[PDB]
């Protein structure tokens, strides 16, 4: 990469990170989609 430097992009990490498994920086999976079914909200006032 000294004679043939990589192409620059603004989204490329400027700081390389190593394998962070076993550390508080480790990756934790989670669902990335929104809630599908919306529940009815009962009225907040007494009905009688």
């Amino acid at each position: 990469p000294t004679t043939k430097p990589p192409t620059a992009r603004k989204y490329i990490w400027t700081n390389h990170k190593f394998n962070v498994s076993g550390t508080p920086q480790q990756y934790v999976p989670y669902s990335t989609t929104r809630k599908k079914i919306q529940e009815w909200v009962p009225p907040s006032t007494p009905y009688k």
């Binding site: 599908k36 079914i37 919306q38 529940e39 009815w40 909200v41 009962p42 009225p43 907040s44 007494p46 009905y47 009688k48």
Partner: protein, 690 residues
């Protein structure tokens, strides 16, 4: 008989005169490739994909338009036919955009599939492609017209089926564009069908856009409950979630079309849902609880009261299993106050004779009938597919249509007799020209709308309509087995409830107010707490929080129509069953199971444990409920008319005004469509154009 003999690849076929080459080919199980031809639309012959060689004929013919001649040998797989198909496919693909990854049609695209089956595998087009601008025609049908292949299917559908002449072609040559030429919305109760007939991704569903691919969807064949037409549908699901609704072909009900409410209101199934049992707090607010506690409270109240003190109201989306379970449970308490929201006249035969509250001609019978009189109805919005069938027979059989009521747009020309109810009597006495028109008809049809029935005099209107039908029956002789008297329903649950013995309307509850009131999906606002004694115990069972849920003491979450296998009877009297597409959300349960569990906790256990046993009980109450495609029935018009002649309730001087006057009133008529954001967008679009 009059058949002629043709040959398909040397195989003999007998066809009737007027059969086209394409139809003769499909008589032997050979499907000719097509783009512009549709068997429910007029022949166009413009796509040229159906070109096929006739033996000893130098020039290929368009199989979709060419009548087949006697002795012709159609060569479906000859070199000439295959080369013609390849050339036409090349021409179709020359300007088509490379959109398949981003096009919603991909995977269920007739252009893609017929390119793979009948086209070549590469390109030799070395020019630039044409690109056209997009047309905004509403919030339902997304338009990307660079993909348009100029089939003219949408134009022919809009003109012939929907009766709207707003689509067309502008320009000519390579520059010909399909559209409206002005910024205009194609808002029809049948508009969404142009998505399905469009072979390509030019017209797509806007609510469905980008969400799923065809190969990952599971198909559940079911029935629509948005009206009383009972259109056969397919629910597409993926990974436990409803994706979209598609028509399912049934020649005698809906053909291959559905209304826009059937097609697009499914998103309301994802909002305002009841997922847990609820009970009132010490303060008076609704709070979640377990099934055990809520059912125990309901059972204690049920054991407290008896007879008239207990009543139930059935909503418009209730199935027959839950209806019969609730009727059995309230009969165990010795209560007969089983009511629906939709009023039907109980005078005379009432619900004793089934043909008294049915569309006895049936939807298919409209094709046969020479004349039809509509009273107090706006069939276009109350029963869109029935109106489509009426327009079909108006177009093809020159049917004469007359309307008594408000002069609504029905997408076909009709003779408007007025809106005064007295016209009926004026017709029945013979003092009207239309009386003579009806007398000389060979297959007359009288349709009375159930919406007209909502009015208090409803009984007088029914008596007058029956008297008109009796005059037709006696004066014009007997034609055999042709039914004249018809009732058109708008409520999916009404006919099953009438078959099971429910009392139409809530008049019984107003006569004797109950201490305990069961609301089974009832969201019409017919009975409020101002109509009931104070400290009345109200139980709401359903799937959505509408008008009914807030005023109840206890909420029992039930299953929607896509979440259960359940029986619905349409306007014709035909029983059909849905299937489970997705299970009920949260703690919600099947409705008849809720009632059976309640009966067990209350000590009066019902004799059925499974769905088969509940359907056996249905057979014990009304056997026609287990015959799942039967539409046949006995004609008991004479007895019903004779009994209706008993009392002489007076008509009112109020013009027949249907609840649905324009398109904006059509989109929201039930708890599911009121919760639908797509229907809200449609209402907003038709109210203000912009």
């Amino acid at each position: 008989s009059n058949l002629i003999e043709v040959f398909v690849d040397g195989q003999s076929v007998m066809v009737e005169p007027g059969t086209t080459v394409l139809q003769a080919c499909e008589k032997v199980g050979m499907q000719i490739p097509r783009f512009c031809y549709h068997e429910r639309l007029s022949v166009a012959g413009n796509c040229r994909m159906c070109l096929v060689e006739i033996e000893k004929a130098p020039k290929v013919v368009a199989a979709c338009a060419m009548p087949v001649m006697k002795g012709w040998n159609i060569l479906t797989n000859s070199e000439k036919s295959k080369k013609a198909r390849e050339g036409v496919m090349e021409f179709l693909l020359a300007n088509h955009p490379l959109d398949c990854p981003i096009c919603d049609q991909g995977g269920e695209c007739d252009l893609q599939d017929q390119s793979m089956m009948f086209g070549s595998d590469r390109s030799r087009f070395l020019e630039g492609k044409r690109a056209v601008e997009d047309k905004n025609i509403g919030p339902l049908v997304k338009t990307i017209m660079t993909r348009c292949i100029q089939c003219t299917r949408c134009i022919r559908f809009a003109s012939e089926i929907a009766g709207v002449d707003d689509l067309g072609t502008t320009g000519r040559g390579n520059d010909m564009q399909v559209g409206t030429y002005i910024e205009k919305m194609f808002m029809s109760e049948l508009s969404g069908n142009i998505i399905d007939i469009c072979p390509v991704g030019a017209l797509t569903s806007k609510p469905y856009a980008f969400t799923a691919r065809p190969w990952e969807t599971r198909k559940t064949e079911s029935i629509d409950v948005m009206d009383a037409v009972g259109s056969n549908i397919v629910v597409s699901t993926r990974t436990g979630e409803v994706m979209r609704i598609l028509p399912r072909m049934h020649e005698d009900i809906n053909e291959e079309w559905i209304s826009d409410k059937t097609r697009f209101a499914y998103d309301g199934l994802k909002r305002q849902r009841l997922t847990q049992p609820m009970i009132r707090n010490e303060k008076g607010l609704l709070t979640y609880t377990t099934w055990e506690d809520a059912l125990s409270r309901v059972a204690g109240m049920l054991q407290s009261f008896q007879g008239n003190d207990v009543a139930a109201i059935a909503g418009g989306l209730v199935d027959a299993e839950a209806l019969v379970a609730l009727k059995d449970l309230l009969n165990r308490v010795d209560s007969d106050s089983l009511c629906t929201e939709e009023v039907f006249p109980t005078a005379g035969a009432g619900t004793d004779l089934r043909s008294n509250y049915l569309l006895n001609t049936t939807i298919a019978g409209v094709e046969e009938a020479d004349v039809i009189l509509l009273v107090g109805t706006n069939p276009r919005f109350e029963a869109p597919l029935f109106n489509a069938r009426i327009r079909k027979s108006w177009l093809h059989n020159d049917l004469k249509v007359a309307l008594i009521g408000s002069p609504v747009d029905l997408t076909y020309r009709y003779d408007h007799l007025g809106d005064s109810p007295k016209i009926l009597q004026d017709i029945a006495s013979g003092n009207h020209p239309f009386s003579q028109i009806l007398k000389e008809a060979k297959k007359p049809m009288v349709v009375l709308g159930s919406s007209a029935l909502q009015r208090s005099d409803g009984t007088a209107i029914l008596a007058a309509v029956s008297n008109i039908a009796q005059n037709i029956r006696l004066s014009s002789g007997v034609t055999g087995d042709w039914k004249v008297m018809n009732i058109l329903h708008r409520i999916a649950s009404q006919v099953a409830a009438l078959d099971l013995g429910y009392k139409p309307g809530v008049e019984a509850i107003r006569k004797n107010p109950p201490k305990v009131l069961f609301l089974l999906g009832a969201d019409g606002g017919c009975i409020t707490r101002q109509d009931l004694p104070k400290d009345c115990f109200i139980i709401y069972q359903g799937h959505h929080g509408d008008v009914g849920a807030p005023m109840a003491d206890v909420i029992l979450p039930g299953a929607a129509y896509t979440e259960k296998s359940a029986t619905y009877v349409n306007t014709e009297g035909r029983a059909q069953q849905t299937k489970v597409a997705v299970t009920p959300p949260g703690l919600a349960r099947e409705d008849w199971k809720i009632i059976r569990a309640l009966s067990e906790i209350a000590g009066m256990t019902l004799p059925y444990d499974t769905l088969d046993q509940v359907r056996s009980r249905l057979e014990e109450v009304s056997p026609n409920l287990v015959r799942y495609d039967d539409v046949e029935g006995a004609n008991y018009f004479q007895q019903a008319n004779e009994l209706s002649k008993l009392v002489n309730q007076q008509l009112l001087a109020d013009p027949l005004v249907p609840p649905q006057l324009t398109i904006k009133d059509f989109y929201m008529t039930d708890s599911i469509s009121r919760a639908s954001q797509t229907m809200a967008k449609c209402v907003k679009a038709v109210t203000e154009g912009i």
